[PDB]
């Protein structure tokens, strides 16, 4: 009908508004900043024990325990300080793409080609990990999940829809729709109130958890977005795509701030993360390597080479002491 | 496919009705957060191995 | 004159040890090369490394000096070690052939009952046969003539031990490898044999290419094994039974002995430096 | 180091790693097959045919990916039905890199039928496009395809009634089951750009209780034998 007409008008208006706010790019503002220099990260720990391509990992809030999800139907809890496997949860479906470790540490999540989010109670009376909950309702593969709190979990699927679930009740508290492609990533805001989701339509979307509606849409990428991560301030985020680029968008400016891309990278980004200060943007690539960029300078501050296969997952501790990279070669690496 | 057009245009106008700050202010706030927490970033500044929990206990 | 042969033997011994150590290290530090077949190839490389660091420097010392100035007990120990290591290398070739035979002709066994325990058992049986061939001369089957000339380190020429060692170390292994690789050739040919005209021509070209590849590979394996060890064991079986009228030139005997020793150099080249997995692993290492 | 808690943690880690190695050894003894095809392409017929008498060697229905575990001639097969995964295939197809084979089932009788999305799109053409996409992914360079051509009897009846020229305008020949079936098989075979690295095993699905599983077993054992020959250097 005729609505599309004014629709594109609105689009143009939005662009104009962003063009109204784009007076000085982030490169110009941070021109006088002293460069971070070359970043020397060496593999501190090598977590071995997975027998298939690892697709997910998530650090704990204690910065010591992490969880890794691999296609050997295994959800291994790792004590990165001592490389000791605290748990090895057998998954009912070996096709797992995501895993989340609860902020309290009592539960851990997983999900994948089975359109189910499995919540496992790590801390119980008998010391045995059991399936505390199986959240169903997504009609596509569960690509990401993040524990909103001890009882609510935000998950993103391949039917182009996110969902906030109440684990105790077991059904979707809210559903976030609007993406026209498979959501492939999901990042929770530090204040627990908002979250950004990157999908296959080359767009990211900032959603409000409580209201359940799309606050903002960021369309800067040329290809599908595989990774997303809030800046530690919570007012910005970074998205890695198969366009062989990461992009730093700002919530308040509602537009892209920076583009992290080099001519020597043609592979897509599987995972992005920020350091504790947000100065270093660590992105895992398909070229078997991880690149550490200067978030304020868009300059490659380092390369975390050392993975035999594609780096699928990446994460920085809450205290920022170390960064763990998982890979399709069935190993995790704690770098620090 | 006309029912979804109303929802799409409503979403677009809702997105356009938000308040936006200058990119210079956002960049300045980002720089301020980066420099204020640069001292507490172990990856930015390599921490001595005495208190590094992944090298020496 | 002795400088030339000394440097040639040193170059041979250095190339052999370098190749075998590189193969062993590549298998050790790469998880890609950690299956049952690569475990057997690595054990063969370890055996050839032992042959290159414990037998080939002493053999070179004996060759350049033309005399064994190390003692009778050291001579007996170094003959036992040489027999053990060479028999172990040959039976590693047989173990690799047998593992390949089970993989080609028994996919069900390959999937279900094939574990690194099988590789460990094959290596253990190989070294057991090596010991069973090496120990008899130390506890018997020895003639006083070996001690008649102190300035020599020849193996025992007892007819019973000649038959025993020469057959259980090369000839029984040779027939075993021939039978196993003939059956593998039959299986490979059976698998290879089993616009429309263009597709049929492409299929025929692929089939002939695969037939040439399998013939070339089996020829490389069996010809390396033969041209390395067959002259030596023919000599070691014929000479003890021909005391007179069969004088052997020293140069020919040394060439044949070192042809046998060159199997330890060629084995990493045949079994490790030719397949794509090892080449990729070495490229990633280097 | 010598503390009781550290020793207990190390012992727990060692026990967990032993269980992990046992599980990996058990999962290495199973043949992983990726089942693919269109919606009404006879995939359910193949699934039911395999799990007739040998199956599986408050939960919630998953509807995401179906697992079919069956044992034939002392060989364990797990077959992954991803027909209900209505999403972008390239975002999850790499999860199946390393399957022994791809069982691709297409209905022979859907050449006349067209997709409900649009009239000008044959179901057979959609199946052919899917086969071309899956046979030539970067993840399936060395992965062989067991091609099942389901509904041979319905296809024979349809070609008795309706000509095959509607599906293939370039096709020219007498309308009979043998020639048309061979033409469709050849058309699906020609989609293999990786002729040297991979092979397509085509079977016409039959009602016999065990010939389809027998063909799957024969194709899988041929794949294993040929992979072993390639490892040795004889293929
Ligand atoms: C007249 C008509 C026709 C006949 C005329 C001509 C054609 C044939 C002639 C006769 C053949 C002679 C030998 C041919 C070898 C040859 O062609 O080798 C190829 C080329 O590689 C290099 O060149 C690179 C290899 C580098 C090796 C290392 C070099 C250093 C060694 C010393 C070690 C210490 C320093 C490192 C590679 O191998 P290939 O083509 O021979 O083919 C196969 C090989 O035979 C199988 O054994 C192998 O299986 P494997 O048993 O697991 O190893 C297969 O994977 C495959 O490689
Ligand atoms: C220095 C001493 C240790 C002697 C070393 C001898 C090898 C260099 C020779 C011995 C047997 C030879 C092989 C005998 C037969 C064949 C099969 C032949 O097959 C073909 O591809 C030919 C075409 C066809 O068979 O149709 C290729 C050469 C090859 C592998 C030969 C390669 C060279 C070999 C291994
Ligand atoms: C398998 C491929 C890589 C080729 C391997 C070559 C070897 C079999 C050759 C290379 C150098 C050769 C040696 C070079 C010189 C000598 C000294 C030569 O001394 C004599 O002539 C002793 C008799 C005498 O003169 O009284 C005896 C053979 C020998 C050890 C040769 C034995 C055979 C060797 C080790
Ligand atoms: O060069 C030396 C010196 C030693 C002592 C130090 C190192 C070696 C002693 C010595 O005799 N020779 C001359 C070689 C003779 C042949 N070699 C090869 C292996 N042989 C064999 N292998 C398996 C089964 C039966 N025989 C017999 C010994």
Total structural domains within chain A: 1
The reply to whether residue A82 touches residue D9, judged by beta carbons under 8 angstroms, is yes
> Could you say which DSSP state residue D71 is in?
E
Tell me the pairing of strands D66-72 and A331-334: unpaired
Other CB atoms within 10 Å distance of the CB of residue D50? 22
**Phi and psi at residue D208, to the nearest 5°:** -65, 140
Active site residues of D: 40, 45, 59, 81, 85
Total structural domains within chain B: 1
**Phi and psi at residue D222, to the nearest 5°:** -65, -40
Instruction: Kindly give, in sequence order, each residue whose CB lies less than 8 Å from that of residue A127, ignoring residues fewer than 6 positions away.
Output: none
Q: Do chains A and B touch (3 or more CB pairs under 8 A)?
A: yes
Among partner residues B34, B46, B47, which is closest to A278 by beta-carbon distance? B34
Residue D186 to residue C211: CA distance in whole angstroms: 25
CA distances to A73, A89, A106, A107, D5 from A125, in Å: 24, 17, 12, 14, 19
Instruction: Kindly give, in sequence order, each residue whose CB lies less than 8 Å from that of residue D212, ignoring residues fewer than 6 positions away.
Output: D46, D49, D50, D148, D203, D205, D206
Domains of chain C: 2-285 (1.20.1070.10)
Residue C96 to residue A336: CA distance in whole angstroms: 44
Residue A69 to residue A330: CA distance in whole angstroms: 10
Nearest to A148 by CA among A180, A100, A110: A100
The string of DSSP codes covering chain C is: -HHHHHHHHHHHHHHHHHHHHHHHHHHHH-STT-SHHHHHHHHHHHHHHHIIIIIHHHHHHHHHHTS-TT-HHHHHHHHHHHHHHHHHHHHHHHHHHHHHHHHHH-HHHHHTT--HHHHHHHHHHHHHHHHHHHSHHHHS---THHHH-SS--PPP--HHHHHHHHIIIIIHHHHHHHHHHHHHHHHHHHHHH--HHHHHHHHHHHHHHHHHHHHHHHHHHHHHHHHHHHHHHHHHHHGGG--SS----HHHHHHHHHHHHHHHHHHHHHHTSSSHHHHHHHHHH-
Other CB atoms within 10 Å distance of the CB of residue C227? 13
Residue C244 to residue C229: CA distance in whole angstroms: 24
CATH of the domain at B38: 4.10.260.10
Structural domain includes residue B24:
yes
DSSP-assigned beta bridge partners for residue A84: A79
The string of DSSP codes covering C235-261 is: HHHHGGG--SS----HHHHHHHHHHHH
Radius of gyration of chain B (CA): 23
Residue D228 to residue A124: CA distance in whole angstroms: 47
Residue D114 to residue D108: CA distance in whole angstroms: 13
Domain around B28: 20-48
- Count, residues in chain D: 235
Residues of B in contact with A6 (CB under 8 A): 9
Structural domain includes residue B9:
no
DSSP-assigned beta bridge partners for residue A88: A76
Residue D75 to residue C106: CA distance in whole angstroms: 12
Structural domain includes residue B29:
yes
Resolution of the entry in angstroms:
2.6
> Could you say which DSSP state residue D116 is in?
T
* Helices and strands (H, E) in chain A, number of each type: 2, 28
Elucidation technique: cryo-EM
Structural domain includes residue B14:
no
Nearest to C88 by CA among C269, C283, C267: C267
Question: With the C-alpha atoms ordered C173, C177, C180, C183, is the resulting torsion angle positive or negative?
Answer: negative
Residue D139 to residue D134: CA distance in whole angstroms: 9
Structural domain includes residue B55:
no
Nearest to A266 by CA among A309, A217, A222: A222
Residue D216 to residue D99: CA distance in whole angstroms: 14
Domain around A35: 1-335
Structural domain includes residue B44:
yes
Tell me the pairing of strands D200-204 and D144-150: parallel
**CA C138 to centroid of ligand 3, rounded, Å:** 29
Name chain C's partners: 3 or more CB pairs within 8 A: A, D
The string of DSSP codes covering A118-162 is: EEEESS-SSS--EEEEEEE--SS-EEEEEESSSSEEEEEESSSEE
Residue pointed to by tokens 């290809």:
A223
CA distance, residue C217 to nearest chain D CA (Å): 6
Residue C71 to residue C79: CA distance in whole angstroms: 12
Residue of D nearest to A71 (CA): D95
CATH of the domain at A100: 2.130.10.10
**Do residues D31 and D76 touch, judged by C-beta distance below 8 A?**
yes
> Sheet of D200-204: strands edge to edge?
D66-72, D75-81, D30-37, D101-107, D144-150, D200-204
């Amino acid at each position: 009908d005729q609505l599309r007409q004014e629709a594109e008008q609105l689009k143009n208006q939005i662009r104009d508004a962003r063009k109204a706010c784009a007076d000085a790019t982030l490169s110009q503002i941070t021109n006088n900043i002293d460069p971070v220099g070359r970043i020397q990260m060496r593999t501190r720990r090598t977590l071995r024990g997975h027998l298939a391509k690892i697709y997910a990992m998530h650090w704990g809030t204690d910065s010591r325990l992490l969880v890794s999800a691999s296609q050997d139907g295994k959800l291994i809890i790792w004590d990165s300080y001592t490389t000791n496997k605290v748990h090895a949860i057998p998954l009912r479906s070996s096709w797992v793409m995501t895993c989340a470790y609860a902020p309290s540490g009592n539960y851990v999540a997983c999900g994948g080609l089975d359109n189910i989010c499995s919540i496992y109670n790590l801390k119980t009376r008998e010391g045995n990990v059991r399936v505390s909950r199986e959240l169903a309702g997504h009609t596509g593969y569960l690509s990401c999940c993040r524990f909103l709190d001890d009882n609510q979990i935000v998950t993103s699927s391949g039917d182009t829809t996110c969902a906030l679930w109440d684990i105790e009740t077991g059904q979707q508290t809210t559903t976030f729709t609007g993406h026209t492609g498979d959501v492939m990533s999901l990042s929770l805001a530090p204040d627990t109130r908002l979250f950004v989701s990157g999908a296959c339509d080359a767009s990211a979307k900032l959603w409000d958890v409580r209201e359940g509606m799309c606050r903002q849409t960021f369309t800067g990428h040329e290809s599908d977005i595989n990774a997303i991560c809030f800046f530690p301030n919570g007012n910005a985020f970074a998205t890695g795509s198969d366009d062989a680029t990461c992009r730093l968008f700002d919530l308040r400016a509602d537009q892209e701030l920076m583009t992290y891309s080099h001519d020597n990278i043609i592979c897509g980004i599987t995972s992005v993360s920020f350091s504790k200060s947000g100065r270093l943007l660590l992105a895992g690539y398909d070229d078997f390597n991880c690149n550490v960029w200067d978030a304020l300078k868009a300059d490659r501050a380092g390369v975390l080479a050392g993975h035999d296969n594609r780096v699928s997952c990446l994460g920085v501790t809450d205290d920022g002491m170390a960064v763990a990279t998982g890979s399709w070669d069935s190993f995790l690496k704690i770098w620090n | 496919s006309i029912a979804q057009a109303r929802k799409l245009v409503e979403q677009l106008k809702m997105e356009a009705n938000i308040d936006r700050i200058k990119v210079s202010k956002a960049a300045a706030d980002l720089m301020a957060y980066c420099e204020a927490h640069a001292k507490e970033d172990p990856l930015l500044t390599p921490v001595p191995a005495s208190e590094n929990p992944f090298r020496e206990k | 004159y002795q400088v030339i042969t000394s440097l040639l033997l040193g170059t041979l011994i250095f190339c052999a040890v370098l190749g075998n150590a590189c193969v062993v290290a590549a298998i050790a530090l790469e998880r890609s090369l950690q299956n049952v077949a690569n475990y057997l190839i690595g054990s063969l490389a370890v055996t050839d490394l032992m042959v290159s660091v414990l037998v080939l420097p002493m053999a070179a010392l004996y060759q350049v000096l033309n005399k064994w100035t190390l003692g009778q007990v050291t001579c007996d120990l170094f003959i036992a070690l040489d027999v053990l290591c060479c028999t172990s290398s040959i039976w590693h070739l047989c173990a690799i052939a047998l593992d390949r035979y089970w993989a080609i002709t028994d996919p069900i066994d390959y999937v279900n009952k094939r574990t690194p325990r099988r590789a460990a058992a094959l290596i253990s049986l190989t070294w057991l046969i090596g010991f069973l061939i090496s120990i008899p001369p130390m506890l018997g089957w020895r003639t006083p003539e070996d001690r008649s000339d102190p300035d020599a380190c020849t193996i025992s020429k007892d007819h019973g031990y000649t038959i025993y060692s020469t057959f259980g170390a090369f000839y029984i292994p040779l027939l075993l490898m021939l039978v196993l690789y003939g059956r593998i050739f039959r299986a490979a040919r059976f698998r290879i044999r089993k616009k429309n005209e263009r597709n049929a021509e492409a299929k025929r070209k692929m089939a002939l290419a695969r037939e040439r590849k399998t013939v070339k590979t089996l020829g490389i394996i069996m010809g390396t094994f033969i041209l390395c060890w067959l002259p030596f064991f023919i000599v070691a079986l014929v000479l003890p039974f021909c005391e007179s009228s069969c004088h052997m030139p020293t140069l020919l005997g040394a060439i044949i002995n070192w042809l046998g020793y060159s199997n330890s150099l060629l084995n990493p080249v045949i079994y490790a430096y030719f397949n794509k997995d090892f080449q990729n692993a070495f490229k990633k290492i280097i | 180091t010598l503390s009781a808690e550290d020793k207990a943690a190390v012992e727990r880690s060692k026990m967990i790693d032993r269980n992990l190695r046992e599980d990996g050894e058990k999962a290495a003894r199973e043949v992983k097959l990726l089942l693919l095809g269109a919606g009404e392409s006879g995939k359910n017929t193949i699934v039911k045919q395999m799990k007739i008498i040998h199956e599986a060697g408050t939960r919630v229905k998953t509807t995401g990916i179906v697992e079919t575990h069956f044992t034939f001639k002392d060989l364990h097969f797990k077959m992954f039905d991803v027909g209900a995964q209505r999403s972008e295939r390239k975002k999850w197809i790499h999860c199946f890199e390393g399957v022994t084979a791809i069982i691709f089932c297409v209905a022979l009788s859907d050449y006349d039928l067209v997709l409900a999305e649009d009239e000008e799109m044959n179901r057979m053409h959609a199946s052919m496009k899917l086969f071309d996409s899956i046979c030539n992914n970067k993840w399936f360079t060395d992965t062989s395809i067991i091609l099942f051509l389901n509904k041979k009897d319905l296809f024979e009846e349809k070609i008795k009634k309706s000509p095959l020229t509607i599906c293939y305008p370039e096709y020219a020949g007498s309308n009979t089951y043998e020639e048309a079936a061979a033409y469709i098989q050849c058309q699906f075979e020609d989609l293999n750009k990786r002729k040297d690295t991979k092979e397509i095993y085509t079977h016409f699905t039959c009602s016999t209780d065990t010939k389809n599983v027998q063909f799957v077993f024969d194709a899988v054992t041929d794949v294993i034998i040929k992979n072993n020959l390639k490892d040795c250097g004889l293929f």
